[PDB]
Design a protein around this ligand. Structure first.
Ligand code: HEC
Ligand code: HEC
Ligand code: HEC
Ligand code: HEC
Ligand code: HEC
Ligand code: HEC
Ligand code: HEC
Ligand code: HEC
Ligand code: HEC
Ligand code: HEC
Ligand code: HEC
Ligand code: HEC
Ligand code: HEC
Ligand code: HEC
Ligand SMILES: O=N[O-]
Ligand SMILES: O=N[O-]
Ligand SMILES: [Ca+2]
Ligand SMILES: [Ca+2]
Ligand SMILES: [Ca+2]
Ligand SMILES: [Ca+2]
Ligand SMILES: [Ca+2]
Ligand SMILES: [Ca+2]
Ligand code: NA
Lengths: 519, 518, 102, 104
């Protein structure tokens, strides 16, 4: 049984925490729920930590008092097909292998599944750790609660005696790095300096050995990623997001300064000694758009290259942890601003971007976003009970599972089947354009070897490579983005038509150039 | 937002609370969650309360940290038919009106429905307050959460300007008294002395004006009826139960001294002005048999009469708040022990007992009880989750709604349909014997006017009245008890066969006596 | 389900009062042969017959009416309580008169 | 495992059985499926039974060759309410006790 500590004594040295804790809705929640500070209190001064107190990062620290939220969070949606590769004819990107050749995602890129699995899935995917980490056996893939209790309760490490990234299975990659983990867990929140910069007080940073880092991490999507544990108020903790919104001055809604001001973020920094160390962003409102944008964004979380000169940009560089915070039509400019690209296409030689799940940046400007709807309204709605205390579902999933509360309460004019039909009209149309975009990209890509072998000039090949960058961007945004257009159907349509336009231009260029060499 | 208080300051005067709070699983739960004691702290002394602190009795005091249990509790089982009169051919007691004539339950006795409604249902039933209290309109009958928020959010009072029990509708009774409320709410837990005895520190007692008392009460089945708010440990608060188990030394399992010792109760008394005032019973284990026995027992909660001389036993008498804590075959002895009966039958003139829902006493000695099964195992089982933190369902309802958890985890040999079939075998058989018992009771009852009018002697009539007591007891136990025999099928069968035997004896006696006068 | 539950609350309550009204009507009716055979006066029997008209009316309205009270729950309740009151009055009248002949 | 007996030996004394068994659809079904008659055959005469043979009356004697019919037969219809007294207002004969009084 927990025994409360004298919080007032803590506050004699922790004024920053005092000011948050005493005013919020956790004012009565004793520190012992999350900290074991006995040896710390025995040895600290206001200027010397003494023994480091233990901080609980497990989600069960919150589940004792918030079981409904915890249980809703940990639910596994079995209908969310697991380990389903996107590069197959029945998934998102039938021609993905041709189009992404040269990038690590070629080794495996599955559709997302329930949040409980995020950290384990990160650990075990074939592209991440050379197959080092595996589920203990194939039964454990079902165990969402186990994954939440801790990754290492359900996974094994092929070689606990080495810490290097290497391939244990032949068709794997070692793309994982420490930045990745920031969107899988925040167990390291007290051990990682803002942005993963080097810092005397940080155990871990961008340049850490990711296998060693991985072993220190356990829990997915900690509850405190969206809720300050001291004030209980809404926040974000993700450095890259705070950096885009606050440091770079882009705001929470870059296209809407008014909404940015009303629904803004306040950066709060915590020091180690006299030096800034970590930060959070306290939200003006409980704005799920911004909470979810901690992860459901396009980012750099990887090394890359400079567009200017092709030189390597390593994990040591700040650019390796970057939120572009740009819509699809602003992305190329945003990548130029930091002089960055991800990979060279294996066939075409084009410098290309790699896009990842840009739900937040896609949602901007959409009819729903402009109407003040937010991710939670469709994906974690309030529970409706005939008799009971309302709470917010934390099972972040498709609205198809809760259409009454996700859609139809707003869309009183529709039946469930009508609402589903409207979703499907957009997804079907968007997917058709994704498929056509891939057809044209593939057609262009296949012309590169023919052109090269025919003696087509480097000037013409580079013109086609410049077209490839854009054809790729305006396609891949949408295979990366998880709504298949629903979050912004007009934008998807314009983008995908642009992709096709660019590929068509490149195909004509290369065909004419080949035909001229012949021839 | 709540601001915590310094509990150490409280504990300076409240040692008992300190001892409980600092050790249990609520050691980190600040007093401000349930008490507003600022003026109290300013004015109290070590022995005088000063200004009374505010104590939250609402169930939402627990719901902010235990939403799952709260929401499970407040769920309304719509399939539990509401306001369904038992004295109908399709319910529990087709011949109830004839058999109960002379008792207030003739005015209305509905089947139970979900716990959320217990206090409002108590207030509005036709037998209780003369029709004084009613739902604000007929829509409100659905509103379980509303009832939980407070009875007076969903009910009206026909005359807020009077506090007397009287009939507002013609076919109502005014049977309610303060004792009843102890099985509907414990909002009065700090305002009611143990047993409802007169006490200088009690606002309410057995002899209070029940309409006034009613108006002070809001919440059904408070969470703290089973869980001590300070220790979070298992308990009971119902005085009558503590009195039976502890004061009268009967034990939690009167038939089993070993189980009584292992699964016992410790009476803790709180004082006012250093005089004993109220009490709780801390349980050794989280034993739902005893928790549920706070209410699901046969009791006195009413005036009555003495068996010895027929004199009135009023609400002022301790016997008006009594747990018999006796199974059906020990009941008559238990009623003789306190020299009490409830009513005289309107037709036969027999002194009769009135039985009420004796689930706890019926469950004793049953195969399930002997095997260590408890009410909660069948009626509020653990929730099974594919992925999640397990908690205990607080929706106390028929196992039919959760057979996998309630039955089939133990009965791995059965399908759901088989388990249901086994329940129905017992219930069908028991009901048939209830019906037959009523047939024979009615046959006897109907002979009394004929016998009296034919000039049959008072001696014969009194012999028949003595048989009526037993015929009634061994029948009514089972219409009162809610399992229709399932809780103890062999006992039901033996009892109901005894009822029939007694009625048959009386029928023969009276017919012979009538025939001899003719 | 909530709406259904609200219907059933009314119908269940009303039906119970219909059944009780019938119980009391039947009790009264069954006293008539006993009273007649005991030599109770035509004056008392006629008083009871006048009560029977009302006891019958305030009951049968509701077995005849198809909503089992739903169409007007307060009216059903008041009526059926009146039926029971009238039957009880008649029962007392006849029992007393029979007992006086005996 | 069952071992067949020589039915012809039986039929020497059991002409009626012979006439029935040899013509019908059980002509190939050996007596041992239902009878253990070894001591009977040792002790019987044409007119005296001698030691009584064992005859299986259990339904599983038929179930090894007719499992479908057996399993269909033994099915329990759970919807056929069990131990449901007819003398109740919700069953077949609400006033049965009054009407049948005097009968078991
Ligand atoms: C002054 C005598 C202190 C008292 C009393 C408490 N803490 Fe403390 N704490 C103190 C210092 C100087 C530091 C280091 C600050 C820095 O410059 O780095 C800390 C740190 C913590 C931490 C963070 C540890 C980490 O992982 O980086 C926590 C969680 C913490 N302290 C909690 C805490 C609790 C709960 C206390 C009351 C029981 C408490 N501290 C008292 C100084 C002092
Ligand atoms: C019990 C000891 C608690 C622990 C452990 C945690 N929380 Fe809590 N939380 C608790 C209370 C009593 C309340 C106030 C409830 C009310 O409405 O009065 C809260 C509130 C929250 C909120 C809502 C805050 C708001 O709306 O401003 C959140 C988001 C919240 N709690 C989250 C949360 C987290 C993430 C926890 C683990 C780090 C956590 N709580 C623990 C009680 C308790
Ligand atoms: C980083 C810590 C995240 C935050 C914050 C949010 N999401 Fe997320 N989401 C994340 C990952 C890594 C995954 C895939 C997990 C895996 O193991 O594959 C997801 C997945 C989803 C899904 C799909 C769920 C399914 O049933 O398939 C949805 C619908 C989703 N995410 C929505 C979502 C919402 C609305 C968020 C804000 C409330 C949110 N996520 C935050 C990573 C992270
Ligand atoms: C008993 C006769 C079994 C049958 C029928 C099924 N499974 Fe099984 N399975 C069984 C055992 C004893 C084990 C090993 C358990 C251990 O921890 O040692 C398993 C294992 C699995 C696995 C994991 C396989 C792996 O290579 O790690 C899976 C995915 C699995 N079982 C699934 C499964 C399915 C879906 C079944 C129905 C088609 C099935 N099993 C039947 C025992 C038995
Ligand atoms: C936040 C900006 C993220 C970073 C940094 C990383 N990932 Fe991620 N990941 C994120 C989300 C929102 C999702 C769900 C949506 C989706 O489109 O998948 C995921 C999902 C994964 C998955 C599961 C799906 C799959 O691709 O197989 C894995 C295996 C995964 N992420 C791994 C991974 C790696 C190796 C990362 C660093 C190179 C990485 N993620 C970073 C959000 C974010
Ligand atoms: C961001 C991706 C979240 C994570 C991680 C967690 N919660 Fe949450 N929570 C989130 C939102 C968008 C809301 C609704 C805010 C609104 O006002 O609309 C909530 C709310 C809560 C609350 C408050 C009570 C309620 O509305 O249910 C609590 C107590 C709460 N959340 C708890 C909680 C727990 C225990 C978590 C880890 C299992 C958790 N939250 C994670 C967003 C996010
Ligand atoms: C309703 C107006 C929505 C808003 C607001 C958000 N999303 Fe959404 N999302 C919506 C739909 C109709 C769909 C398609 C779901 C389907 O079953 O067809 C999606 C999809 C997603 C997904 C993938 C879910 C899955 O396929 O299992 C994710 C990860 C997702 N959406 C995330 C997300 C984010 C982060 C949002 C705020 C920025 C957001 N969605 C808002 C409907 C709506
Ligand atoms: C948050 C501020 C709480 C309030 C308000 C209530 N309870 Fe609580 N309870 C709380 C915690 C942190 C715990 C311990 C959780 C754990 O398992 O460690 C509990 C525990 C209980 C228990 C279990 C006790 C046991 O098993 O010994 C019960 C039965 C319980 N709480 C009941 C309860 C009641 C009835 C409340 C209103 C009077 C109540 N709790 C409020 C936190 C909080
Ligand atoms: C007194 C405060 C009670 C306690 C303690 C328990 N029960 Fe109860 N129960 C009580 C009443 C007054 C009622 C009727 C409520 C009404 O408004 O009619 C009930 C009802 C039940 C039922 C029937 C529920 C239904 O769906 O019809 C059940 C199954 C039941 N009670 C079980 C039960 C259990 C198992 C208890 C211990 C955990 C328990 N009750 C306690 C009064 C009280
Ligand atoms: C605890 C020993 C109780 C006492 C004292 C009173 N009641 Fe009760 N009541 C109790 C239980 C366990 C139940 C549910 C089980 C059942 O068989 O009903 C009830 C139910 C009611 C109801 C609803 C059902 C009905 O009879 O219409 C009402 C209206 C009710 N109780 C009223 C009532 C009155 C007026 C009381 C004092 C005379 C009284 N109850 C006391 C438990 C207990
Ligand atoms: C007696 C009739 C109860 C009432 C009133 C309440 N609860 Fe309960 N609770 C009860 C039992 C039998 C149990 C299980 C005990 C066991 O160990 O088997 C519980 C348990 C709890 C717990 C502990 C966690 C869990 O098992 O779910 C909590 C936090 C709890 N109960 C809370 C709670 C609340 C909030 C109530 C009012 C809505 C409540 N309980 C009433 C029995 C009884
Ligand atoms: C399982 C072995 C049980 C135990 C232990 C307890 N009860 Fe029970 N009860 C059980 C059944 C099968 C039934 C019949 C339910 C049906 O739907 O046919 C009952 C019934 C009740 C009821 C009435 C429920 C209703 O009809 O809605 C009540 C109020 C009840 N039981 C209370 C109760 C008590 C208080 C118990 C412990 C003393 C108890 N039951 C144990 C099965 C089981
Ligand atoms: C296998 C060794 C058998 C035993 C044991 C029993 N029966 Fe049989 N039966 C058997 C065969 C090979 C056949 C003929 C199938 C066909 O259609 O050609 C039968 C037939 C029957 C019939 C149908 C007869 C008809 O339509 O004329 C019946 C009704 C029948 N058998 C019943 C039956 C009984 C009741 C048994 C136990 C006493 C029994 N059979 C055993 C093979 C075998
Ligand atoms: C609009 C055309 C309605 C129709 C169709 C139904 N109801 Fe209604 N009902 C309606 C109103 C405006 C009111 C009064 C609201 C108020 O508070 O003033 C009601 C009331 C009821 C009630 C309460 C009856 C009473 O107190 O006497 C009930 C039980 C009720 N309504 C139920 C109900 C049912 C079940 C319906 C479908 C058959 C139904 N109503 C239709 C408006 C309308
Ligand atoms: O992006 N994962
Ligand atoms: O007993 N009510
Ligand atoms: Ca998915
Ligand atoms: Ca990217
Ligand atoms: Ca080809
Ligand atoms: Ca019921
Ligand atoms: Ca009684
Ligand atoms: Ca009759
Ligand atoms: Na605890």
């Amino acid at each position: 049984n927990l025994k409360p500590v004298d919080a007032m004594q803590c506050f004699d040295c922790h004024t920053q925490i005092e000011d948050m804790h005493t005013v919020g809705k956790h004012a009565t929640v004793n520190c012992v729920h999350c900290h074991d500070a006995t040896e710390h209190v025995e040895t600290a001064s206001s200027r010397r930590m003494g023994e480091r107190p233990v901080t609980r990062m497990d989600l069960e620290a919150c589940a004792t008092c918030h079981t409904a939220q915890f249980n809703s969070f940990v639910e596994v949606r079995h209908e969310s097909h697991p380990r389903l590769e996107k590069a197959t004819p029945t998934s998102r990107s039938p021609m993905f292998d041709k189009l992404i050749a040269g990038h690590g995602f070629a080794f495996e890129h599955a559709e997302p599944r329930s949040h409980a699995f995020m950290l384990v899935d990160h650990f075990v995917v074939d592209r991440a750790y050379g197959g080092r980490f595996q589920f203990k056996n194939w039964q454990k893939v079902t165990d969402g609660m186990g994954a939440v209790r801790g990754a290492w309760t359900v996974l094994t490490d092929a070689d606990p005696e080495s810490s290097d990234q290497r391939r244990f299975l032949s068709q794997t990659a070692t793309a994982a790095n420490p930045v990745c983990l920031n969107c899988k867990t925040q167990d390291h929140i007290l051990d990682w300096a803002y942005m993963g910069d080097e810092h005397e007080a940080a155990k871990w940073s961008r340049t850490s050995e990711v296998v060693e880092f991985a072993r220190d991490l356990n829990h997915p999507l900690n509850c405190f990623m969206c809720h300050d544990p001291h004030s209980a108020g809404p926040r974000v903790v993700r450095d890259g997001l705070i950096n885009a919104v606050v440091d770079r001055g882009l705001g929470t809604y870059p296209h809407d300064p008014v909404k940015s001001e009303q629904q803004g973020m306040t950066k709060v920094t915590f020091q180690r000694g006299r030096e800034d160390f970590r930060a959070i962003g306290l939200l003006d409102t409980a704005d799920s758009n911004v909470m979810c944008a901690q992860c459901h964004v396009e980012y750099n979380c990887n090394p890359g290259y400079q567009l200017s000169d092709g030189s390597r940009v390593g994990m040591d560089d700040r650019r390796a942890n970057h939120f572009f915070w740009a819509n699809v039509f602003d992305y190329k400019e945003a990548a130029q601003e930091i002089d960055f690209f991800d990979f060279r296409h294996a066939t075409t030689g084009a410098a290309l971007p790699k896009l990842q799940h840009p739900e937040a940046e896609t949602f901007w400007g959409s009819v729903h976003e402009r109407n003040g709807v937010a991710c939670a309204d469709c994906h974690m709605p309030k529970v409706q009970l005939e008799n009971g205390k309302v709470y917010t579902s934390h099972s972040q999933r498709t609205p198809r599972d809760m259409m009454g509360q996700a859609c139809l309460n707003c869309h009183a004019e529709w039946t469930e089947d009508q609402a589903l039909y409207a979703i499907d009209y957009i997804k079907n149309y968007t997917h058709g354009k994704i498929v056509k975009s891939e057809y044209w990209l593939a057609k262009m890509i296949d012309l590169f070897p023919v052109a090269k072998r025919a003696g087509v000039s480097e000037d013409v090949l580079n013109q086609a490579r410049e077209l490839h960058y854009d054809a790729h961007l305006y396609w891949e945004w949408w295979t990366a983005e998880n709504s298949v257009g629903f979050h912004n159907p007009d934008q998807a349509r314009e983008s995908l038509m642009t992709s096709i336009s660019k590929s068509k231009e490149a195909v004509s260029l290369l065909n004419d150039a080949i035909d001229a060499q012949v021839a």
